[PDB]
């Protein structure tokens, strides 16, 4: 049943989880960045 394979998936999902969350946190900052003083940068 390749037990290691099951554990490997967890590790892989763990890495993507951090990256996936990172973007989420950044997105939140963008929302608050458009509230104060317009949004300076258009991108």
């Amino acid at each position: 049943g390749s037990p290691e394979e099951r554990e490997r998936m967890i590790k892989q999902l763990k890495e993507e989880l951090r990256l996936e969350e990172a973007k989420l946190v950044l997105l939140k900052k963008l929302r608050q960045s458009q509230i104060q003083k317009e949004a300076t940068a258009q991108k």
Binding site: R6, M9, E16, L17, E20, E21, R31
Partner: protein, 36 residues
Amino acid sequence: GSKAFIVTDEDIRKQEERVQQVRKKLEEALMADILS
């Protein structure tokens, strides 16, 4: 312009909820190191 990108409060919530689900499978699948 119209083809611009605007982030909505809800759209953001759906993103967080989706991620939360992934974590669940992480801690859950991890909590079964001996069970599974």
